[PDB]
Each structure stands twice: as C-alpha cells, then as structure tokens.
Amino acid sequence: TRNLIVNPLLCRKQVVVDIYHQTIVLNGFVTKYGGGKTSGFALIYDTLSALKKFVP
C-alpha cells in the first residue's frame, strides 16, 4: 500500500499501510478528523530472529 521499500540489509519491507475505513511492526498511525480513513507504516521482519534482535 502507498510506497513499499525492500530492505534486505535490515531484512524487512517498509510499506505505508492505508486503512480506508509476532513478525510485524505496527506503529506511526494518525487518523483524520472524526475518524474514518487512517494511515500508518507497516514493517515486516519475516524471521522472528529479526524481531528478536532488530528492535530498539
């Protein structure tokens, strides 16, 4: 959704998830006025080891 960036070095994909209403990162979400559409960034780390190590 929106723009997707393939990151091999960090073994992840950076995709901007648009909502038109243990291996994933859900953060950076801000809706519109009065609810409705909401946007955000979706990060997928495939391997659980990545989430086990590639997290601040």
Partner: protein
C-alpha cells in the same frame, strides 16, 4: 572552546544536507578523513534520507558496522564516514553501485552506476611535491598520496583511478578543450567547457566556462574540476546532465 569540538548543532550544519529545522537539536558531525566538513555527506545521511533504508540512527549503526558498505574499493565501518565527491559507494547485498556527484541544485546526488563502471573513479590532483630522496608524488582531491606518478601529472589535472588495482589508468590535462564539472558556489554542479582562463598575479585565477547551451559563467580556479577531454564525459552525468534552466 579549549579544544576541538565534537557536537554539531542542527542549524550550523551545511545547508546542502536539507535537515529539517525541527528534526532535532544536533546534526551528525562527520569525522575527519578524506573529505572536508562542508564538502562531504556523512554516511548516516546517505542511508537515512537519500535511500531511506534506516529510519533512525539505531538502524544505521546496525548496517555500517555489519560490513555492508564499500566506500571505494575498500569497506568502511564508520557511521559518520565523510562521503564526499564522486567516490563510489557500493552495497553488495542489494547489488547497487551509486556515486556521489553534484547537480545544479547545489546538492549531492546519487547517480546509479553499473558494476563495470563502479570499478574506477576519477580523482583531481591538488598538488605535486618532491619528497626526500627525490621521490616525487601527487595529492588528489581525496587526500590520497599516490606513489611514483607519471612525470606529466601536474598540479591541476585529472587522473583515473582503479579500485581493485590502485594504478592510474588515464590522465587529462588542464587546457581550453576539456569538459569540467563544478564544485563551487553559484556555478556549483554545472557541466561545461573551459574556454578562457584569465590570470591575476595577486590572489586568484579566474576561469570562464562555456555551457553546452552557449551560456557563459565564470568562477574561481579552485572550483574547476576537469571531467573529460574534447567535450567528452568519463562518467555518467546526473539526471539533469549538468544543465541549468534559467
């Protein structure tokens, strides 16, 4: 201050990094090395903003220290390595070989390259001096002290360097029939042809550079960087082809 500084405030950072004024208090100070403070782009800014691989500095140190960057032929593991002029940058993992050239917007640009053309990189001689024991040598714009050079490699020429070998492939003199890229002020990031160099004994040497479209703009001899011979470019120029639109 009683000694050298270590921090860099955000607003004192060079303008051509385009750092948001409300991003944060400090800016990544580029460590010393081949390129100056204001002539270089720190390796952190190349990956966080230009390529957007890493969102914050947490994920930049997780990359550069992972032996996943090859500045020129060698491999660098410094988060704030000074990445300056057309010194090539390569990432074997993603299989991409960029290069840091200028452009007309006074900004460092990442021109994509192929694997073959990434094996070499152009350097500009800064000075030539005679060492002790009559061992002459030359200094490039990258701070490289190359060993026994060609006798005709004078002060302000341009040489061709090889990453794998380290030898000198081809050398271009400084005359009135060569293509030059600009690293200076107003004329920064512009390609053109040297047509006239008027000499003032006192302070500076002024060079008139004629553009491809017939536009003529002058500059200081320091900012001139010969890129080829006979209206030919040895490297792939950026997207705008070094042309300026009035």
């Amino acid at each position: 201050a009683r000694g050298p500084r270590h921090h860099l405030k955000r607003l004192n950072a060079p303008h051509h990094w385009m750092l948001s004024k409300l991003g944060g208090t400090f800016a990544p100070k580029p460590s010393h090395g081949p390129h100056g403070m204001k002539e270089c782009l720190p390796l952190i800014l190349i990956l966080r903003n230009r390529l957007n691989y890493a969102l914050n500095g947490r994920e930049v140190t997780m990359i550069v220290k992972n032996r996943t960057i090859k500045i020129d032929g060698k491999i660098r593991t410094d988060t704030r390595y000074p990445v300056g002029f057309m010194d090539v940058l390569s990432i074997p993992r993603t299989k991409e070989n960029f290069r840091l050239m200028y452009n007309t917007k006074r900004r460092f640009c990442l021109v994509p390259l192929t694997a073959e053309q990434a094996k070499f990189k152009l350097c500009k001689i800064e000075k030539r001096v005679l060492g002790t024991g009559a061992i002459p040598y030359i200094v490039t714009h990258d701070g490289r002290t190359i060993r026994y050079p060609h006798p005709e490699l004078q002060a302000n020429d341009t040489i061709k360097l090889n990453l794998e070998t380290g030898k000198i492939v081809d050398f271009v003199k400084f005359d009135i029939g060569n293509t030059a890229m600009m690293i200076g002020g107003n004329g920064m990031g512009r390609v053109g042809v040297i047509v006239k160099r008027e000499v003032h004994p006192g302070s500076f040497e002024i060079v008139h550079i004629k553009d491809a479209k017939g536009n003529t703009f002058t500059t200081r001899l320091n900012n001139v960087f010969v890129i080829g011979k006979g209206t030919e470019t040895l490297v792939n120029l950026p997207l705008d082809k070094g042309i300026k639109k009035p």
